[PDB]
Each structure stands twice: as C-alpha cells, then as structure tokens.
Write an enzyme that holds these catalytic residues in place. Structure first.
Site, PDB file in Angstrom:
ATOM      1  N   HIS A   1       9.421 -14.653 -26.586  1.00 25.82           N
ATOM      2  CA  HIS A   1       9.480 -13.630 -27.792  1.00 25.82           C
ATOM      3  C   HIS A   1       8.557 -13.631 -28.471  1.00 25.82           C
ATOM      4  CE1 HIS A   1      10.804 -16.516 -30.279  1.00 25.82           C
ATOM      5  NE2 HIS A   1       9.651 -16.093 -31.334  1.00 25.82           N
TER       6      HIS A   1
ATOM      7  N   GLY B   1       6.005 -19.818 -37.820  1.00 29.10           N
ATOM      8  CA  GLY B   1       5.193 -20.198 -37.072  1.00 29.10           C
ATOM      9  C   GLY B   1       5.288 -21.242 -35.789  1.00 29.10           C
TER      10      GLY B   1
ATOM     11  N   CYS C   1       7.602 -21.703 -33.860  1.00 27.06           N
ATOM     12  CA  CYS C   1       8.209 -21.344 -32.704  1.00 27.06           C
ATOM     13  C   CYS C   1       8.053 -21.895 -31.988  1.00 27.06           C
ATOM     14  CB  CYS C   1       8.435 -19.872 -32.653  1.00 27.06           C
ATOM     15  SG  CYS C   1       9.654 -19.798 -33.834  1.00 27.06           S
TER      16      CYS C   1
END
Ligand code: NA
Lengths: 300, 303
Positions: B39, B141, B143
C-alpha cells in the site's frame, strides 16, 4: 495500544564482551579502548564471602584477565578500579562504540536492560529504579555486567551495571562509576532492601495512558488538593507527588483534558476502594514502571 | 516473570524507509531486496478498493525512493508477492543476518521492532492472538515494522505490520505478504472476530509456577485431550492441538507433571476459579508466555 517498550538494543549489543578471571566469567562493556565490568570477577568462591578488593586486585596482572569479543581475544594492557567497577584498558578500540554518557538515574526513572550471558546478548526489557533502589529484573547466573541504558537521539546514557540478586528475587547494581544504588555491598551475604514504595507520578502517567487507550471506568467528577492527595498517598506507601511531578504530567493532562488533581482524585478512590476485580490496560494491579516521558513517547 | 524481547540489533541493521511521493513507510533490507507493504503505492482517494495490479503497472523502478537513513539505494527491479512489494536494489546489505521467513501460529510470541521513517524507536514482545490480531503499540508511520524471533544468530521474520483495527488491535502479514486472519489491505470495514485465551500458553505459565514452587493447583485427576478441549471451549479457551501437547514436552519432563494432568489442573481452575489465591503473584492466568518463553527465561539462552 500501550505496552512496556524497551529501547532498540543494537548500539549496546556492539559493546558487549566476556571477561574471565580464573573460573569466574561475566559480561563487560567495551567503549573505545576500555572494558568496564563488575570488580567481583577477580574473586573465588572463598573470596566472595568477605572480599578485600584492593588486596585481591594487587595480586592480579593484566594476563589474569581474558577479554573475548565474539571469538577474538583482546589483550589487556592496563587495569584499574573505580568503586565496584573494574576498567580493563585493551590494545584495540571498539569501532561500534556509540556516542555515550554515564549517568546516575533517580528513583522512579526507567531504563532498558540488555541481559547478557558469556558476552552474548539474550534479551531486552524495560525496568524502573525502585524508590528502595532495587530493580525488578530477570537475571540468572552469568548476567553480571549486563547494563541498563536510555537512548536519546544517537546517544546511549548508561545508568546501570548488574551485580546482585537479593533473597526476595529483586536485583541490585551500580552506576558505571561503580557506586551501588541503595545500601548494598558486593559481598556474598543475604541483604534486605528498605521498605518499597509505589512511584506515584508513574501510576498517574499510566492512568493517563489508560484513558488515552479508552479505559475510563476509574474516572470520577471529583478533585483533591495536592496536600490532601499526598496524605492519602503516604498512608498507602506511595511516594509524595511534587509540583515538579504535576508540571511533568502537564502534556498528558492537556492531551486528555483531565487536570492532574482530578486524576489524583481517581487514584485516591482506587487506593481506598480497590479495583473490585476490574482491570486497567489488562492489569489487576496499578502499574508504576512507566514515566510520563515513556507514556508520551509511546502515545504520540 | 517479565515479557522479554529478543535483542534487536540484527533487525535494526535491516530497516530502511520506502517512499512513493509523500507516503513513507518502513522496509526490510535483506541481501539486495527490500520488502515492504504494497500500500506504499496507494493514494488517499483510492484506498477503499485499490486495484494493486493496475497501480503497480503504472509504477517504474524510478518512482521508488529507498533510503538507509539519508542514503538512497537505487531500485533496479520491483514485483508484488501477495500484499508485499519486493524492491531489488543495487546494494547487498552488509548487515544482513542469517534469516528465514516463517508463518507463525496463534499463541506464538515474537519481538516487534517499532520503526518510524526507517528509524527504530522501541522493541517489545507480543503474542499472535487466536483471532489473528496483535495487541501492539503502533502509531501512524509504523507500517512495514517487523516481528521476529532469534534462534542461534538466525533471525526468523514472522510479521510485517499493515493496519490498526477499530478496537485498537493490529493486523499484518508474513514476509510472503499473506495476511494473518481474514484481513485485507483496503481502508474498509473489518472487525476482528471474538478472541479466545491461548490454552497452551496458560499451561506453560502453570508449569513456570510449579518450577518456582507455586503448586497448590495440582490435583489427583487427569483428562483425555478430547474431554479437555470440549470443556476449554465452554470457557472461551482455545482447544489444544497435537503440536501444543508436543511443545509442552520439555516442561512436562522438567516438572514430572504429565501434560493431561496439568490440563485436569487447569480445568479445575476454570470450573472453580482461584478463590482469592494467586499463581506467581497474579490473580489472572497469563496467556502470552509460550513454553519456549518459559524455558528461555528460566535458562541461559543467548543468540
Ligand atoms: Na479462572
């Protein structure tokens, strides 16, 4: 969410070595060209009951100390003692040496421990310096010389070296100048700590973490004065809350809109009524090993 | 007993940042590949049901900014494997440890290295729940942060962080990009299904209590595994598998307490409660220490 979180340990792992003297092996800290370790590495089983350390050290030479970094021997070219720490000068600089400081922490302050055995890092976890200057650690035989630290930017502040497990199963040790926290001594004797007390400012920081993570059952419409709160806190063997502490809880107060003395009134009721078999952030007990800074860092 | 994380240094040396535009998240740099959540290629207006195959077609190597701190690693190939992007870079990571990619089961614990913009902030232990969520501490932040175990200098990577569910629990994938649980990487309506207690870990904790001399809960009874599993499910406890019975073997041998005798002990605790009495100074039965974690913590294990 909200968990006990340790500092990443890599900057400290690159400094851990093994120090051997006779059949005593423990951990040392290798910064630039010096290895720091507990001075009781120089003792035998007979020595450790009542050691005269200045006498024991003068009977040693550089070659009595085997320092190993991984499977490489470093040569000891000097030794001295500073309080309960031995400083072994080696002929090799550690290129993994981080920016660092030696600091002496205050009771209630937290730090990360890198537990090590035979110079090899095993685990990392967060502790607090208790008000009675013990730490509730996890340390086994061979953990001596493990260190505790905080990291700020790229700078490691070393605050703890491990020496002892008391009969109650809590831990005692020194700062990196070799001074014990607490009334302890590096002899093989059963030592008791002073009565322990709860770190009030930290409990309040954890209740604020609880609110932030949606756990609010314990809040109430009431306020208290700082003095009235301190009278109750002292009755329950909680440390006094100072105006400095009230100030340090400011950001968490602002974030949640709950004034510090309103959170004080919630804690007073928890102490007086108990939790009635309810939990806060998964705990059946009030948690006092998160500082205000630890809660802000993790909750941003 | 403490939750202890693995030392994080071998993983710290593999964390990088991956940016598309102003979307930055963490990636894992092993040899000459960087792994990250796919993503990173999404825009905000298109995250309800992104067409990842058609978003990736429009991307080229030069649209990916991979940085070790402020040092750019040039991307020389890209591909998608399930929900993970793999970016081939022209530099092999000199800090690459010996590693494996593993898919863990519910109940297994692992260390998380929480990172922001490729910079490690903290390390903590956590357990994969039976509903395939983790009770993490993750902010925007985080991920691409990973979860791992270490066995003899070999890092087994098991988790990469993707999303926060409405209840504040976390979900993610293995390093092959397969989600744990029924979750999908779209900003849609997803709820984790009801959780259960990790029975094998409660039994490990009871063994830890016996090792430490706390053994009032041991009874004269035994049970079959099937009878135990049917009773456990009535108390929202997970059934035991044959693998659970086998991983309790070492603690059973150490204590001399057969696994099914400990099961009969836990069954009595579930039926009768603890009646004031604590176990290891807890009124609550702990379910996030595995049999390995009990042995790791009672023994000298280094990596
Ligand atoms: Na129960």
């Amino acid at each position: 969410g909200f968990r006990k979180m340790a500092f990443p340990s890599g900057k400290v792992e690159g400094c851990m070595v093994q120090v051997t003297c006779g059949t005593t092996t423990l951990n040392g800290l290798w910064l630039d060209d010096v290895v720091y370790c507990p001075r009781h590495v120089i003792c035998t089983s007979e020595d450790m009951l009542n050691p005269n350390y200045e006498d024991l050290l003068i009977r040693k030479s550089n070659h009595n100390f085997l320092v190993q970094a991984g499977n490489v021997q470093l040569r000891v070219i000097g030794h001295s003692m500073q309080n309960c720490v031995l400083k072994l000068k080696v002929d090799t600089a550690n290129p993994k040496t981080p920016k660092y400081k030696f600091v002496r922490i205050q009771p209630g302050q937290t730090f990360s421990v890198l537990a090590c055995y035979n110079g090899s890092p095993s685990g990392v976890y967060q502790c607090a310096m208790r008000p009675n200057f013990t730490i509730k650690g996890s340390f086994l035989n061979g953990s001596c010389g493990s260190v505790g630290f905080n990291i700020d930017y790229d700078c490691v502040s070393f605050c703890y070296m491990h020496h002892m497990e008391l009969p109650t199963g809590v831990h005692a040790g020194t700062d990196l100048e070799g001074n014990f926290y607490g009334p302890f001594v590096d002899r093989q004797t059963a030592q008791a700590a002073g009565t322990d007390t709860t770190i009030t400012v930290n409990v309040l920081a954890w209740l604020y973490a609880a609110v932030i993570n949606g756990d609010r059952w314990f809040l109430n419409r009431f306020t208290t004065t700082l003095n009235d709160f301190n009278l109750v806190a002292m009755k329950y063997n909680y440390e006094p809350l100072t105006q400095d502490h009230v100030d340090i809880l400011g950001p968490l107060s602002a974030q949640t809109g709950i004034a510090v003395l309103d959170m004080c009134a919630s804690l007073k009721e928890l102490l007086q009524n108990g939790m009635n078999g309810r939990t806060i952030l998964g705990s059946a007990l009030l948690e006092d090993e998160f500082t205000p800074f630890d809660v802000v860092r993790q909750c941003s």
